[PDB]
């Protein structure tokens, strides 16, 4: 069902997606342990992900959520990093992408900070790092992240000191860091149909000068 269309670096759509990656890197409280040490990326490719069945599945859930929330989908563009990225772009998000031991409950996690999603590219906690060097901070191996369209609807706000159901009468959770004033939010959804993986971004983290 899925086709990938390469965006040209001269295309304005490529450029705003790259801007969103680059501008949302932050420092992490683990000193780079999970995702590596870097302030920016080398973007190698950005592809648009095109799958009619998945798209309709997404917009069908969206209209329902919309209707339950004063005609507001509360739709965002959020990052998602995962070792299952190739599986997500072909078959969609589902329970198997959920984070069972997640702090905001057992759903699928999305981040405003691209560098937060970068931490999960090689699995929970960075796993053992790139397949080739077992290096969580590998500067060589090509990584991939998804930049996804995510329906939040009524989102339950959970302040954090940083597949389950949504809390009653909510469509997602917002995990909002209250200690790190520079950390952006994470959001959790409990239905795969609430996210469409629009862009596949291939990149490397850059060693700082």
- The binding site consists of 130, 133, 138, 141
DSSP assignment of 94-118? -GGG--TT-TT-SSEEEESSHHHHH
Verify binding: residue 186, ligand AJ7, rule CB under 6 A.
yes
Per the annotation, where are the binding residues for Zn(2+)?
Answer: 130, 133, 138, 141
Please report how close the Cβ of residue 124 comes to ligand AJ7 at its closest, in angstroms. 5
In this chain, which of 63, 96, 133, 142 binds Zn ion, going by CB under 5 A?
133
69 or 82, CB closer to ligand AJ7?
82
Task: Return the closest-CA partner of residue 194 out of 130, 163, 150.
Answer: 150
Please report how close the Cβ of residue 138 comes to Zn ion at its closest, in angstroms. 3
- Residues 55-94 interacting with ligand AJ7 (rule: CB under 6 A): 79-82
Task: Return the closest-CA partner of residue 36 out of 152, 118, 111.
Answer: 118
* Cα 40 to Cα 24: distance, rounded to the nearest angstrom: 9
In this chain, which of 69, 117, 151, 194 binds ligand AJ7, going by CB under 6 A?
117
Q: What are the structure tokens assigned to 120, written together? A: 């999960």
Verify binding: residue 124, ligand AJ7, rule CB under 6 A.
yes
* Cα 189 to Cα 163: distance, rounded to the nearest angstrom: 10
How many C-beta atoms lie closer than 10 Å to residue 173's C-beta?
26
154 and 171 in contact (C-beta within 8 Å)? yes
Verify binding: residue 99, ligand AJ7, rule CB under 6 A.
yes
Verify binding: residue 109, ligand AJ7, rule CB under 6 A.
yes
* Cα 11 to Cα 94: distance, rounded to the nearest angstrom: 32
Choose the one of ligand AJ7, Zn ion, none that binds residue 62, judging by a C-beta under 5 to 8 angstroms depending on kind: none
Using the contact rule CB under 6 A, the part of the chain among 23-31, 57-65, 109-117, 135-143 near ligand AJ7 is 109-117
Q: What are the structure tokens assigned to 135, written together? A: 């290096």
Using the contact rule CB under 5 A, the part of the chain among 6-14, 67-75, 118-126, 139-147 near Zn ion is 139-147
Task: Return the closest-CA partner of residue 180 out of 105, 113, 106, 123.
Answer: 113
Using the contact rule CB under 6 A, the part of the chain among 114-122, 130-138, 157-165, 197-205 near ligand AJ7 is 114-122
Report the interface residues with ligand AJ7, using CB under 6 A.
Answer: 79-82, 99, 109, 111, 116-117, 120, 123-124, 186
């Amino acid at each position: 069902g899925t086709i990938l269309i390469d965006l040209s670096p001269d295309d304005k759509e490529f450029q705003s997606v790259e801007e969103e990656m680059q501008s949302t890197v932050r420092e992490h409280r683990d000193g780079g342990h999970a995702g590596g040490i870097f302030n920016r990326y080398n973007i190698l490719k950005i592809q648009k992900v095109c799958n009619k069945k998945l798209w309709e599945r997404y917009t069908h859930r969206r209209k329902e959520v919309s209707e339950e929330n004063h005609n507001h989908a509360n739709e965002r563009m959020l990052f998602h990093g995962s070792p299952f990225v190739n599986a997500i772009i072909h078959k969609g998000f589902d329970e198997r992408h959920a984070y069972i031991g997640g702090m905001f409950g057992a759903g699928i996690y999305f981040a405003e900070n691209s560098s937060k999603s970068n931490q999960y590219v090689y699995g929970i906690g960075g796993g053992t790092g790139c397949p080739v060097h077992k290096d969580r901070s590998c500067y060589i191996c090509h990584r991939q992240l998804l930049f996804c369209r995510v329906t939040l609807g009524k989102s339950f706000l959970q302040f954090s000191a940083m597949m389950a159901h949504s809390p009653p009468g909510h469509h997602s959770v917002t995990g909002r860091p209250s200690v790190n004033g520079l950390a952006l939010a994470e959001y959790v959804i409990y239905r795969g149909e609430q996210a469409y993986p629009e862009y596949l971004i291939t990149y490397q983290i850059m060693r700082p000068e």
